[model samples]
Target: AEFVPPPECPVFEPSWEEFTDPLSFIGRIRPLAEKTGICKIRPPKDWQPPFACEVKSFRFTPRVQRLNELEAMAVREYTLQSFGEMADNFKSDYFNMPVHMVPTELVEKEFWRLVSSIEEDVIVEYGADISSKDFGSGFPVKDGRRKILPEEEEYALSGWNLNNMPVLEQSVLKVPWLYVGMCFSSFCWHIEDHWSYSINYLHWGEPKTWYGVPSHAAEQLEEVMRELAPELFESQPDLLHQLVTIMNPNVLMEHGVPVYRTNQCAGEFVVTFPRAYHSGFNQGYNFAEAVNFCT
Candidate 1:
């Protein structure tokens, strides 16, 4: 049978005036977007926050991921330029065309195919890590040593900025995680801890495709996943939290669970509501940052 992608999720394009306050803008759209579990927020056309990394010097070790639904491993290091070159070529070579020339729908269909195939054995790499001593945040912080740019500082201190959490000391939940993704590199289905809301910003590069299940159908989705992959649940009762797995959206739809899809492009934010299960893959090379928050 052919793959039929889920319906597109709601997208909000806010004007500069409406998007002044990140949290307030989110609150305004929460009523509508929350129903879909995830939605994309396209910032005003002029809103471009400068990237603060030195590509040639920025180095990171990429995590190798097999196209399968369930496993990954970490690998050696490469500078951003080196990694970008590899990522671009890998995608172009795999599809036998220029990276951007490949249609999104075709990529989606092929993604499902390779992931489900036993003989294909496609593997890709990506970087995901919390901000730390080794690599500082890409967002400008209020460290007294240097004067921060007005635009960058505003973003760093925005109400939605998890780094500005009021009370608790900094922890993994508060620190933003930087993601460097390549073609077909995916994140499996999972929900935020404590059913918290999560916001992700794509700094630049190609779009990332997301599939989400609404919070209202969370239990139903769990039931279906447990029924289909009972062995996974049997060994680890909390397998969903500890070990994430990718199940086709079609399977969830066939089983009557609702799922929505979206493509978050550069300068856009994708917010996931509490208890919503989301999984996604980068269409090509990209840089994104995400942090979890709760009301």
Candidate 2:
């Protein structure tokens, strides 16, 4: 059966009268930063908000296989052959790259089954149109395409689908609208309401990376990304250094720096705050995934 989600998750953006002050919130969470990329919370687990999903992380391999079947037929196709090099660089670092967003619901369904049945097998060939007509972002995107989503869509309407999957309600939002599907290659670190929250999750296919700072630290957050989306790493060297430093500025300078895997595997996920800046990369014939949203 098709889903009919509720309107939107109900969010109470705290004001001055809220439980904690901005500076205080940072003071408390800073201690937990190094340990995770995603820190999840719920007003009430019994109560559902958009499932505050984290794009799980995973490792990469060069092995090739089938991808022709299981994808939407009408959509034209393209491929990134020998993406091995790209994956290596992405594993190192990247701004952002558009990958694919195939949900497990779609993946496991017999109606749209993946051509392969091997465990941990990625399906890059499978995808939906996700056109403006689908999940509209309600803003003028770079392409002069349609914005605002229709009052009703293929998925459930608002907060908590009938099945109890979370959803973000209309009133709690700051921007008129935003859109989230699965993951792409793009590095999206822009803070929500300037880092009032954090998020981290495990993943599959390839690794995802993120570096974020305290909300008030404008010196590190300021960067001109209009030239490049996700803001170029070169465009803002200082901030990049700051993240490296936070990870271990002094220790890493003399001794060799070790590599940390960014991609989380299928059951692995990172918790993140609105403050966490993050992105990822991928290379495979086929990949599909799922994600929920924060209220």
Candidate 3:
């Protein structure tokens, strides 16, 4: 529940025009849902995550206070269940108590509580880990070749399109990072490592809430974070210089910093440009994956 109530960040439902420059702006292409390629991941028929039972390889460190306040306290691991079955657990008793018993506000609070431990929650560069035939990016190799439309041809020149570049190129981080999210698990406020561009795709499951700040306002967002959570930066002088750290948007907007919101649903993609500070949490159990690239 890294989520906080009241004056939530604004979610954008953009027209194709606004979505053209995805890096500069936060846009949602609902139509893209039709071909996300995620439906192709069927969990290998009778397959379950190996680490799920071990409770080790991955980590789930709750964002204390916010959605971290929920009540789900037990931690069970591993399921021979299908990916669909696992997703259902995300809605079923797997994460939270049945929604009906709790009041609306409390329902959300309790919902966050669902994967509280190993009980709880929750990627890659390019190349070997993801580039293999066994596990590859859902983005088609053809789509990366060039823009099919004449009007959109200019998008090809944009630096974020790593798929179009040579794989052996030095700038390619070429690593794919994978993520498995349970309710309340979250990523803190921060930009991509080295201020690079990141393309994220929600493979499946529930929605994820997002908040973003433009590169123009990156400094402003930092200044405001300093003012509100001075202790955080004070502890580590270069804290803001790192990849990720958590911060509440309600605080940022209060200080006059513009932060936009979005609910990235299954099958959709989210692309963040260099220095665009973005942060969000999964709405329920889901699988999302992403990778970064540099020009």
Candidate 4:
């Protein structure tokens, strides 16, 4: 893939008070840098969770070329073969370790260990099932943790939280999801399911590089995608509806579609607006928690 420098996305260093009101455009905000919450999440001082979600619930796929090479193969294989066939084609493995064992510092160090390896790097997703039930949000209750400010307490009751929504509610997407990614482990370009906005918080680790196309340019992106990988669209008209899809950002830039970029460091929040097309690679291993919601 050719190098097409990415454009910077809209970034705001809003005060916690300013962000609560929300905005109309797609952008990134860092209100939490000087904020607190219902649950102050950090690696446990010494203990952890019961479910082995970090290691148990997910699988890792091996990289062949670099990031671009793997994405090209994914697009090609998805179009040219069966889903099962594509799975067999990739060299990957599954593991069963408790996410609890993966302390914040432990994974940060291990993430670097894996990415720096000359042999391989893998992507790990700690699904919704493994998140801690006891410490749901980032704030502590009337317990030892500090109390929530009066104005901010509204968010605790905010209907926007996906985890609080019951499955019976059609609005519910899923519980908050935890993800672990090493260098080159990535998320592909696509909108949030059902066109809802997404908020991702990097708990701790190396930075994650992101590229985004606003909602207005979404169709333009789709048109370019069809032109580049027609077979993928032809074989599966609902291809974009599926989770596994990736295309190099340079390709979009070459086609004249604007691509905005950002490097999300730990303690910052990366918010993607409805229908925003975003994708990116990790600089190294990291832990992030995120969820989808409608206004």
Please give, for residues 1-295, the per-residue lDDT of candidate 3 as tens digits.
3545433332344454454454334223323221221111111222111111111223232222233222221223432233334444545564366522323344244443432433543210101122312233333333443224443444334322334432233545664555656554566678766776676766566676666776778888878766655354445554443433555566676777766666676756666656878776665556665777554
Candidate 3 Cα misplacement greater than 4 A, ranges: 1-91, 94-173, 230-244
Deviating ranges (above 4 Å) for candidate 1:
54-56, 69-74, 130-133, 144-173, 230-235, 239-242
lDDT of 2 by residue, 141-253 (tens): 32233322333231123221221223353455422221211222223234444234433222224433322333333333333222222323345554453332212111221
Backbone N/Cα/C clashes per model: 0, 69, 17, 10
Please name the candidate that would achieve the greatest lDDT relative to the true structure. 1
lDDT measured at residue 133 in model 3 versus the true structure, 0 to 100: 29
User: In what order do the candidates fall by TM-score, top score first?
Assistant: 1, 4, 3, 2
TM of each candidate vs. truth: 0.89, 0.31, 0.53, 0.56
C-alpha lDDT (0 to 100) for residue 23 of candidate 4: 33
- Please report the TM-score between candidate 4 and the true structure: 0.56
* Better structure of 1 and 3 per lDDT: 1
Give the root-mean-square deviation of each candidate in angstroms: 3.4, 16.4, 11.1, 11.6
Better of 1 and 4 by lDDT: 1
- By lDDT, is 3 or 4 better? 4
Worst 10 residues of 2 by lDDT: 244-253
In candidate 2, stretches whose alpha carbon ends up further than 4 angstroms from where it belongs are: 1-31, 34-75, 78-166, 169-184, 193-203, 209-219, 223-261, 283-295
